[PDB]
Structure formats: C-alpha cells, structure tokens
Amino acid sequence: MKQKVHSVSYLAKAEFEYKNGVYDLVALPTGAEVIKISLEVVGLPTAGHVSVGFKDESKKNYSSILTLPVNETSGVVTKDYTVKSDKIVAAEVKDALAEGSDGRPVKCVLRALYFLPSVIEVEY
Amino acid sequence: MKQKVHSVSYLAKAEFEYKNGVYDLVALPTGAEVIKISLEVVGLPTAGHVSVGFKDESKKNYSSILTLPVNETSGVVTKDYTVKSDKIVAAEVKDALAEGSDGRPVKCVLRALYFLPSVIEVEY
Amino acid sequence: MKQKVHSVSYLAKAEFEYKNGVYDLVALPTGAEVIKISLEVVGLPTAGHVSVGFKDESKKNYSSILTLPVNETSGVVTKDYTVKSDKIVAAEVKDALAEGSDGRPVKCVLRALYFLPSVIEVEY
Numbered sequence: 001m002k003q004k005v006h007s008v009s010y011l012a013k014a015e016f017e018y019k020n021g022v023y024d025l026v027a028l029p030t031g032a033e034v035i036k037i038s039l040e041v042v043g044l045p046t047a048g049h050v051s052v053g054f055k056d057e058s059k060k061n062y063s064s065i066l067t068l069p070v071n072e073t074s075g076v077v078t079k080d081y082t083v084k085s086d087k088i089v090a091a092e093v094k095d096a097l098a099e100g101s102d103g104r105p106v107k108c109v110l111r112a113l114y115f116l117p118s119v120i121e122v123e124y
Numbered sequence: 125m126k127q128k129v130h131s132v133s134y135l136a137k138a139e140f141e142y143k144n145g146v147y148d149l150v151a152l153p154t155g156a157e158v159i160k161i162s163l164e165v166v167g168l169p170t171a172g173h174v175s176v177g178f179k180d181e182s183k184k185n186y187s188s189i190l191t192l193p194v195n196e197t198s199g200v201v202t203k204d205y206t207v208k209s210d211k212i213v214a215a216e217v218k219d220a221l222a223e224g225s226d227g228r229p230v231k232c233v234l235r236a237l238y239f240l241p242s243v244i245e246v247e248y
Numbered sequence: 249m250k251q252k253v254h255s256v257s258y259l260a261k262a263e264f265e266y267k268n269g270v271y272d273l274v275a276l277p278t279g280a281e282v283i284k285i286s287l288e289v290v291g292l293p294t295a296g297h298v299s300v301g302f303k304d305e306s307k308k309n310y311s312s313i314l315t316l317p318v319n320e321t322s323g324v325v326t327k328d329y330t331v332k333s334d335k336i337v338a339a340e341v342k343d344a345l346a347e348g349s350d351g352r353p354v355k356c357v358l359r360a361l362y363f364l365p366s367v368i369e370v371e372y
Contacts, residue, residue, distance in 0.1 A: 011257065
C-alpha cells in the first residue's frame with residue numbers, strides 16, 4: 001500500500017491563574033492537526049467556569065469548544081480539528097474568586113498535542 | 125532504570141463522502157501501535173450510521189470497532205490495538221441519503237495516530 | 249507568534265500476567281509529560297481489580313490513578329500529569345484467580361504515551 005502521513009508532532013503546555021479574563025495559550029500553524037487538548041485544574045476552586053476554544057490571530061473570533069465547571073476539575077475536548085485561520089487556543093474564566101477553600105492559588109494547565117502540516121509518503 | 129520504547133509516530137488523515145459502501149482509509153504496518161482513532165462528521169446528516177473497524181489486507185475480514193449514529197457526529201475508539209495481519213482501517217456506511225437538511229455534502233474525516241514498530245532503548 | 253513546545257515523544261509497552269501483586273511497568277524521566285495511559289485486558293477474567301498509579305523510584309509511594317474492575321476490560325486515565333519525583337508507573341492486582349472461564353492466561357497491557365522534557369522554540 002501507499003499513503004501520506006504526518007510525521008512531526010508537538011505538545012504545548014500553558015498555565016494560567018484561574019482569574020477572570022482571557023488567555024492566549026497555544027500558537028498553532030496553518031494546516032496543523034490538533035489531536036489532543038486536555039485542561040487540568042490544580043487546586044480547589046469553589047465557584048467558576050473555564051471555557052477553552054479557538055480564537056483568530058487578531059480578530060476577536062473566540063468560540064468555546066470545551067466548557068469546564070468547578071466540580072469535574074478536568075476535561076479533554078471530544079473532537080479533532082484542522083487549523084485554518086483559527087490559530088490561537090484561548091481560555092476564558094468568566095467567574096473567579098480568590099484562592100478558595102485552601103488559601104492556595106488555583107491554576108489551570110492546558111496541554112495541546114498537535115501534528116504539523118508537513119507530510120511524508122510511506123508504503124507498507 | 126532501562127526500558128524499550130517506540131520512538132516513531134505517524135498520524136494519517138482520510139476523508140470519505142458519507143455514501144453507502146466501504147472505504148479503506150489508513151494503511152498500517154505490522155507491529156504498529158494504534159493509540160488514537162478519531163472519526164469526525166462534517167455536515168448535517170439526517171439518517172445513517174458509520175462503523176469503523178479493522179479489515180485484512182485482501183481477505184474480507186471487516187469487524188467494526190466503533191459505531192457512530194447520526195446524532196453525536198463524532199467518536200473516538202475506546203481501546204488501543206496492536207497491528208497483526210489486520211493492516212487496514214476501514215469505514216462502512218450502510219445507510220446514507222443525499223446531502224441532507226443543508227444541500228451540502230456531508231463528509232467524514234478519520235484521523236489515526238499510531239506508533240511505528242521500531243523500538244529504541246532508553247535509560248532514566 | 250512564538251512559543252515553546254515539546255518535540256520528542258515516546259510510547260512504552262508493558263505486559264503483566266493479571267496475578268496478585270504489584271508491577272513496575274513504565275520508567276519516566278523528570279519533567280516528562282504523560283498524555284496517555286491506556287490499560288487493556290486480554291483474556292476473560294472473572295474476579296479481580298487492576299489499579300494503575302504512580303510510584304516513587306524507591307520509596308513505597310504508590311497511589312492509584314485509574315481503577316479497572318473485571319467487566320469493562322479496558323480503561324484510559326482521565327487526567328494528564330507532569331512527572332516530578334514520581335517516576336514509576338505501577339500496577340496492582342489485589343484480587344486474582346486462575347486463567348478463568350477459558351483455561352488461557354489473562355494478561356494486561358499498559359501503553360504509556362509521554363513527551364520528553366526537552367523543549368524547542370517555534371514561531372508561527
């Protein structure tokens with residue numbers, strides 16, 4: 001057989017402080033293939049929501065792809081995307097209070113596993 | 125410590141037209157380790173089912189590993205497989221009508237992330 | 249844009265015999281990023297539980313991160329971890345009987361996909 005496959009893959013870590021606002025976490029090239037986005041909450045928040053989505057490089061085209069309330073504290077996107085003009089992974093925390101129930105800062109870590117647009121030919 | 129790990133990993137994209145029949149999407153070498161198969165439905169189908177599975181290179185040994193009705197529109201296989209004599213990822217659409225509710229062709233994209241059988245030795 | 253990404257990724261296979269006790273399966277470097285741990289049960293066990301978790305290199309700090317009863321036979325960890333002083337993936341089988349309902353040895357395979365701590369700079 002013969003096929004075209006993506007041979008280069010990167011993983012990007014970003015961390016934000018679980019504070020109200022928006023954050024630009026992962027930079028993505030055009031044609032990249034996102035196969036994993038995992039959001040992790042380190043700490044014990046009491047009230048808030050974290051929504052991760054795709055935002056354009058400059059124009060404010062944010063659109064949440066995964067929502068995450070307080071209780072589950074972790075979440076992976078259920079769908080795989082191909083990058084086209086939406087080259088920023090962004091996070092939004094619309095509700096956020098202080099450290100919360102512990103006196104320690106609640107943080108969030110987003111890990112993005114994506115394959116580069118470069119393609120090679122393999123025969124099996 | 126010391127261990128043997130897979131150092132080479134590929135991602136394969138395939139696209140089909142959500143039409144009745146079968147399609148051979150991803151070619152796999154013997155000993156490859158499939159760690160991800162994600163199926164995505166781009167469009168608004170109204171009636172149908174897509175079943176992805178493993179088929180032998182020539183003999184008709186199709187066996188569905190993931191079923192996908194219309195409503196969820198996306199699905200990832202829940203199990204990881206090691207390739208042995210079943211070297212084709214294949215898709216079957218047994219029910220399929222026209223574009224559907226939009227006038228635009230409904231398509232499906234299958235992304236397969238698999239590690240090559242080549243192994244190196246790493247000490248930590 | 250500009251960002252720092254992990255460019256090196258490994259996959260490790262380990263196999264154990266579904267027998268009562270503990271097993272040290274995957275060796276992990278400090279700063280490595282675990283993005284996948286999948287546990288697979290090959291065979292037909294009748295009674296038992298398999299708990300996978302992180303154990304320190306020498307000191308007995310086992311802590312299960314995923315539990316797996318008999319019936320589902322497969323499971324992936326729901327959270328991503330960064331390695332720090334907990335550099336062993338370990339499995340524990342606290343209940344285990346003979347081959348079980350088939351006369352053939354029940355085995356378990358754990359696949360660990362993790363990115364190396366090495367980081368490069370990419371501009372998009």
